[model samples]
Target: NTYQEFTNIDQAKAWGNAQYKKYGLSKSEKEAIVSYTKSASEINGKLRQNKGVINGFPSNLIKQVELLDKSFNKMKTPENIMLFRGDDPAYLGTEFQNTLLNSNGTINKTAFEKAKAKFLNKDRLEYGYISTSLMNVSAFAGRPIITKFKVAKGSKAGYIDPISAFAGQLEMLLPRHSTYHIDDMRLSSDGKQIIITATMMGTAINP
Candidate 1:
């Protein structure tokens, strides 16, 4: 579930204090986590406000991705981290489905094809940064396309679990240039949305 957005830095700090009490983080560490979340939140708002164009370029967004990349790598480990990302159907085209089905043809082909007929890259590794919440927050209104990520053990990508970031939002950061193996895709139980499951294969060497 998603937590409400903080209106200001003071509110973010207040919420962080109460929510992070159980995490056992040092004052500085907690402060840093809150700052990261704050940066991300601000970038998100800027993207929306500028229609994704910040002064005709995304330098700030790129800078944030790099910062997160370095920080998360310092905390890397070999373990499974489940992440979720919600998207609007209008944004997710057929590339994802084509990638999965073309490789392994065992999923619900009928539903998959139907979705493709209604709407519209493979092995070519995805570049740039992508964000996913540690908790399943993509079920919010207008975002029915939920992608579930299972970061497999031994994957090269590093991630950070920012506890109390945005007050229990469970924000997880995955840096740019990671690769994943598409595992499964199917219609949701309500038949109104599609659920995709993927496994992180590794990170690109030169991203």
Candidate 2:
């Protein structure tokens, strides 16, 4: 849901069941969506720094993460490719590259090249970049079941971004009914146009 709506699925299901359900999907279609609940993907964003369970990546949420990259004034785009440094926690870190601006509101190619070399490693290394924002609550929580990789440093970590670019890393976990179950799903190279599938179970013919 948007900032104007609920926080998680449990609230959405309890109050916005109509919005949670996919009006365009059918009984068979709904079942099809559920069938892929265990499905996964290799998204192109940074490794989350937190340990929130990823239910699904709805296009709406992705868009929100991307837009938050901007601020009130002309500012460094809040975006980066985050990843584990290596099996050793000493390796997980961040960098500044030519393609992106630095924290001081400046972009330097040489400095970026140096940073890029350490992380990208002439293409030998793999990572994902995503839009950065203070509002990506779920992104901070966790990643999709199939897209997550190794257990975080302490069997706990948190990270978030929009449109990460990387190899075939993934995640595995289940829905925390503490929230709500995501019913429909869609993912693609493009950030927009992905659909989240679901159904209504509250009350009323209009409901």
Candidate 3:
């Protein structure tokens, strides 16, 4: 920019032309934005009665960053999650980073390392977050579905032999400690039942 203020019309035009950027999008193009801003929901009473169903789906849901605010019943200041379990098994989700944040939304690897080191020094324990984007329950009929498999022999009908329903119930509740508590926010616990309240975007027939 010229040192002189815009006393001449040519100066303003030159400045504007110099700053013009060739943005990729056309002036009249359409774009879609997604939003999941709302409240927690429930997904119960929608699973199958059959216990041997293999169900699954594509992992295209919008991944999110969930911040934990632990109360633990006796603490005042909120402590961040040094140890946290993710949605998928092994807890490593690329959509989820266990690092610190910057004002511009870039990853601050150094800050993350420092915070992690501090936590380790204080607690003498280390917890790692993992990615589970590829995790899925095998041999289940429908996704979020549960089925019963025979683990024993039975002599009566309708009441099968020694078998248990193999549902996806391996999730551990937050704050797994004896006295710790999740202050307010928590994910809704559901399986196929979540379809009841979920507003589907595309059309998929139910069998």
Q: Which stretches of model 1 miss by more than 4 angstroms?
A: 1-65, 94-124, 138-142, 154-165, 205-207
Task: Evaluate model 1: give its lDDT.
Answer: 0.50
- Which candidate number maximizes lDDT? 1
Q: What TM-score would every model get versus the actual structure?
A: 0.53, 0.22, 0.18
Top TM-score: which candidate number? 1
- Tens-digit per-residue lDDT, 1-207, candidate 2: 211222444432333233223233334433322322322222333213322222355664443323322110122212221122112112224432223333453433454344334433221122222112222234433221111121212211112111123212221111111121234333323322122222211111010
- Residue 149, model 2: lDDT of 20
RMSD of each: 10.3, 19.9, 26.7
Q: lDDT of each prediction vs. the true structure?
A: 0.50, 0.25, 0.20
Summarize candidate 1's per-residue lDDT along 1-207 as a digit string, tens digits.
222333454454454344334334444444444566656556554544454333554665555434444444344424555667776543345454443232333334564675545432122234544566555652343455677777654343322343434443444455545666656666777555567676665654323
Cα deviation in Å at residue 188, candidate 2? 27
Q: Compute the lDDT for candidate 3.
A: 0.20
lDDT of 3 at 117: 42
Better of 1 and 2 by lDDT: 1
